[PDB]
Scaffold this motif. Sequence first.
Motif, mmCIF file in Angstrom:
data_model
loop_
_atom_site.group_PDB
_atom_site.id
_atom_site.type_symbol
_atom_site.label_atom_id
_atom_site.label_comp_id
_atom_site.label_asym_id
_atom_site.label_seq_id
_atom_site.Cartn_x
_atom_site.Cartn_y
_atom_site.Cartn_z
ATOM 1 N N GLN A 272 0.818 -1.209 0.000
ATOM 2 C CA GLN A 272 0.000 0.000 0.000
ATOM 3 C C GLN A 272 0.855 1.263 0.000
ATOM 4 N N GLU B 49 2.958 1.855 -3.206
ATOM 5 C CA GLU B 49 2.133 2.485 -4.234
ATOM 6 C C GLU B 49 1.863 3.953 -3.910
ATOM 7 N N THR C 223 4.480 -7.392 -8.066
ATOM 8 C CA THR C 223 4.032 -6.617 -9.214
ATOM 9 C C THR C 223 4.084 -5.134 -8.883
ATOM 10 N N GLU D 147 -0.553 -1.280 -13.010
ATOM 11 C CA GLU D 147 -1.929 -0.866 -12.799
ATOM 12 C C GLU D 147 -2.867 -2.025 -13.119
ATOM 13 N N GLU D 148 -4.142 -1.866 -12.759
ATOM 14 C CA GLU D 148 -5.091 -2.973 -12.876
ATOM 15 C C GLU D 148 -5.339 -3.353 -14.334
ATOM 16 N N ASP D 149 -5.683 -2.368 -15.168
ATOM 17 C CA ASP D 149 -5.969 -2.648 -16.572
ATOM 18 C C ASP D 149 -4.748 -3.195 -17.299
ATOM 19 N N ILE E 27 -2.367 -4.990 -15.718
ATOM 20 C CA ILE E 27 -2.254 -6.350 -15.209
ATOM 21 C C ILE E 27 -3.139 -7.289 -16.016
ATOM 22 N N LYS E 28 -4.352 -6.846 -16.346
ATOM 23 C CA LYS E 28 -5.273 -7.737 -17.049
ATOM 24 C C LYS E 28 -4.764 -8.062 -18.449
ATOM 25 N N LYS F 11 -2.117 -10.636 -18.168
ATOM 26 C CA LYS F 11 -2.799 -11.898 -17.885
ATOM 27 C C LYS F 11 -3.278 -12.558 -19.172
ATOM 28 N N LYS G 142 6.605 1.661 -13.349
ATOM 29 C CA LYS G 142 5.311 0.993 -13.410
ATOM 30 C C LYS G 142 5.237 -0.039 -14.530
#
Lengths: 109, 69, 84, 97, 111, 104, 86, 97, 95
Positions: free
Chosen positions: D85, D88, G9, G12-14, G16-17, G20, G69
């Motif tokens: 956390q 980030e 990792t 960011e989320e998008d 990461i997807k 994947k 990142k």
Amino acid sequence: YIKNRFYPSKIQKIIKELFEDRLKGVEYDPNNANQLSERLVLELREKIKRGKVPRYKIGVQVVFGEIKGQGLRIASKCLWDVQNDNYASYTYTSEKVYCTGIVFGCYFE
Amino acid sequence: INFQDTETRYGGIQNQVVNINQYVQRNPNFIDLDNIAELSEHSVNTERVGMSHKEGGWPFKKRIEKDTS
Amino acid sequence: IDMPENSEMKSMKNDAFSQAKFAVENYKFENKISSHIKKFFDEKYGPNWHCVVGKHFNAYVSYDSKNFIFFYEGQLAILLYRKG
Amino acid sequence: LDSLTEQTKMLSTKLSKPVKDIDSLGYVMETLEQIRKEQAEIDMKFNPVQEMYSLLDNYLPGGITDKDEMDARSLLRRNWDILIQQAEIKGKEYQHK
Amino acid sequence: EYISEEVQKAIDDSVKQVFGIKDDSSQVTITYNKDKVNLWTQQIIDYTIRGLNKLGKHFKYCVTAILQQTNHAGISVQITAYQDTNTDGSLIQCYEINDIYAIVSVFAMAV
Amino acid sequence: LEPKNPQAPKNITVYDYYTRKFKTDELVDQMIVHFSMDGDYIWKESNEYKTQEEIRDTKKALIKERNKFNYNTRECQTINPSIRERGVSTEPPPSDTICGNITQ
Amino acid sequence: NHEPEVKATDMEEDMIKRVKEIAINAVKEYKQEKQIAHYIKYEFDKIDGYGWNCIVGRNFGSHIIHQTKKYIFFKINELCLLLWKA
Amino acid sequence: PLPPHIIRFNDMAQHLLKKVIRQADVLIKENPQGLEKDIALNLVKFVKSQPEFKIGDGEWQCIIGKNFGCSLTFDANVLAFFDLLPSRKSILLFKSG
Amino acid sequence: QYKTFMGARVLWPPECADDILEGAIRETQDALKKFEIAREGQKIAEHLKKYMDDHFDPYWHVFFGKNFGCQAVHNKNRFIYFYIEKTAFLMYQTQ
């Protein structure tokens, strides 16, 4: 009529054992390369003499050189009734030399 | 089987050195390297030879008894 | 009489018995038995396993710790272990 | 458990202790992240404890002496979650400002 | 009364004389061209057969050529025939410069 | 004859890490190859001259205005199990051999 | 078979997807380590310019850098896939 | 004569690899036990020392392992990966690009 | 027709190579004669595969006994099959 027959890999045997134990990692010295080939070709021929093929004629052939940034292709063709006559072929390459031998066999009749 | 014979020949090629626009190397070159070897499957077995008969008890040494009688 | 060990929880030890007991009865040749065991364990846990079946044989292999199972199953003897 | 926990909590207290390392960072943050890469190896040398305390608290949940166990183990993973956390968030806000 | 080694020598003379240049820059100013590949194949074959009929040997030959654009696709070249032991035979050759993957396959037979 | 290539395997397998099975492959390439050499000489190509000269151009103009701020070291290592050599034995099971007579 | 999973990792989320999906597709399509690495490096070179690095293995050690990142290390069915940029 | 080995992939001139083979062999013999950390450290500290190996885009990296796969933006010039037959250590050497 | 060899009855001609052959054709009876007896089982094949992996290529498989017979596919030209005093020996190398 062929009671005793030729299959490839006993000459392939002889040719492998010969290659390692005779080449023993020799370098490609230009003054004695052709005569090195001359020696081991006749040694190989002596070995096929006990190679136990009565009527199979033996077209020995050998290649010896050094690999130095050098691409190469070697190929042969087989030309006989597949039932009786046959061939054998081996390759043996160290870091800087390559020696490859082929031995034909043609049942006399 | 006396099969002595010998030959020789040579090829070669034309020679020309241009050397006007030369000596380049694409620097950001890319290659594909591995660390792998080929594979196979030596699937082995055992050769097997097994058959039964029915031994039948007695029912003469000579097939025809009249010949002996 | 002899039972070499593997990981705890009986995750693979309990599995190998239940699989090999079906394998032995289902086939006569060792080919299908051992191939069945290995092919199953490959899907189940690992990338590469090794299995041996037979009445009498001795062996000496390298393997990965706690991944070596060996058991006298009925009259037969089944060896298994991960490697690779 | 105590040793590994004192390590991780020391990393956290280095993140939190000086007003300096709070506002003006330095190469010490690179060492914190170095220990964060190491944190793999640190849990690798700690993993003997996870399975062993698993075997222990299998039939011995404790409740009396499990005080320091809870403190230390949960403190390890507390450093881990604040690692994710705060890594980030601090990265983002230090980028902003 | 021949040697396939020299047959290959003649093929190499033909090809490397036609397009092969020692100084390796014109060989990529000459990259694979949809318009010029027809001329290339025909003239390679014609010059190779001119080299072959320079030979006064009474053997009978036949030739085949393959020109591949790029190494990404991959190819397999294999040979097989049915002829007489002593004199007949064949020959193959692979060839690469920058972006042209040439292959030559020749059959030589008696009579 | 339809040539078979000596000094070759007959079928290729490999593990699939998406579908946890193997899958073999019994077609094997049969072209004898020795000494493939990769080259790096590139003459007035359209695709490579642009992609090289552009990156060198942008790097040098950027430095003409160390420039990318100093990088940060990292570390990661995997778990390496130990290799042990252990060998065990089975035995041929025993058997008995008696002899008895038939009673009245 | 099993889905991917990140052990460490920084994405960011998008993003990461996307990795994947690309990893799943790479492993379904190709079956070799260099082929998977080449394909995924190529995919992310198409989507995110030049400078991607992708290490695909089973037990390796690394000391690398990256853009802040653009780093990820995840495992799929006992496969360690590391990826970073610059 | 060199000690036996299997070059799985090499890119540098062959004498560079000769030197690498000889020193890596004598070093694996001098440090037969411990961790591959010490091997890597000694190999880097030796390889970085010679007046040879002049050109470098980034700097030296060596990886020792027994079961892995990788892919690097190595400097297009120098790269080596081979094995020492007696111990079977897949050793890798390059310069960061 | 299982022709004779100074070591044993070998299927002539076989599918292997002679440093391997001569090595096995000497090493099998060398092993069996020196300190080994037919009473022991696969502690023979143990030393046999060990000796093969020491000098020759590393991945070998050995099968010997009094009743067996195999089909398979292996490394080209790595097939030793010989009987000796009514005891079949089979060896093959796999990459």
